[PDB]
Design a binder for this molecule. Structure first.
Ligand SMILES: O=C(O)c1ncsc1NS(=O)(=O)c1ccccc1
Ligand SMILES: O=C(O)c1ncsc1NS(=O)(=O)c1ccccc1
Ligand SMILES: [Zn+2]
Ligand SMILES: [Zn+2]
Length: 232
């Protein structure tokens, strides 16, 4: 029942209730002739919603807000982007125009600026050193260290034991490294072990792309990263 590219037209978004007051959002983008899904998170914050990551671009993100509006019917007041790439900040300007307060670390804002990407308005302090965690409403934000990108954050919903790994965590189906241009391969496994150490109780692990699972996604990702590191 988890939505795949199958159930999702180009320019459309599906929501998936993972737990009470926690959903993933699923969108698709065409890239180099293939079609790849992407996940973000939606977390109920009393009578409002906290959004984790855009739906990979302005059109998808306007569909996401319409689909939230239609299916949950609570306002999105804040959004956090988990790193600087376009599947995470692309659509920020849409969210901003809808009155959503957009947030990212200074590290992510700096990198999004160097990249010419959209730049979330608000700064998330206290995440600059590996292993930093800060509370953000119904979630904890964690900086595990450099992995998929130097700035990548992970998100934990303590009430539902939902860990959103973002692009630092691969789905089981992904058996080779994806985009690693901005990755720190030497630190990625160490950063994953920081996630392991910090959230050993997590019950649902949502990767940046694809199928949810459990904490076996962290080891899976370690395996894939090391295999890549050892390419000859
Ligand atoms: O900080 C903000 O921009 C903001 N957004 C929605 S309510 C509020 N304050
Ligand atoms: O890993 C990711 O988080 C990722 N996010 C968007 S795309 C991609 N991975 S990707 O398909 O392998 C790629 C991107 C850009 C250029 C080539 C390949
Ligand atoms: Zn990325
Ligand atoms: Zn990605």
């Amino acid at each position: 029942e988890y939505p795949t590219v199958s159930e999702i037209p180009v320019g459309e978004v599906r929501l998936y209730q993972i737990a009470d007051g926690v959903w993933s959002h699923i969108a698709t983008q065409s890239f180099d002739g293939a079609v790849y899904p992407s996940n973000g998170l939606i977390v109920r914050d009393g009578d409002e919603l906290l959004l984790i990551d855009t739906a990979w671009g302005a059109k998808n993100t306007a569909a996401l807000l319409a689909e939230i509006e239609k299916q949950i019917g609570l306002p999105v007041t804040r959004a956090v982007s988990t790193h600087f790439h376009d599947d995470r900040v692309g659509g920020v300007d849409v969210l901003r125009a809808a009155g959503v307060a957009t947030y990212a670390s200074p590290s992510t804002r700096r990198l999004a600026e160097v990249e010419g990407n959209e730049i979330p308005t608000h700064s998330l302090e206290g995440l600059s050193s590996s292993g930093d965690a800060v509370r953000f409403g119904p979630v904890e934000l964690f900086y595990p260290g450099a992995a998929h990108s130097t700035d990548n954050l992970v998100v934990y919903v303590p009430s539902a034991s939902v860990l959103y790994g973002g692009c630092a965590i691969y789905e089981l189906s992904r058996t080779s490294a994806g985009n690693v241009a901005d990755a720190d391969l030497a630190e990625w496994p160490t950063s994953i072990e920081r996630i392991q150490q910090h959230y050993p109780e997590a019950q649902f692990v949502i990767p940046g792309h694809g199928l949810p699972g459990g904490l076996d996604l962290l080891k899976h990702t370690t395996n894939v990263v090391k295999a890549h590191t050892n390419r000859s």
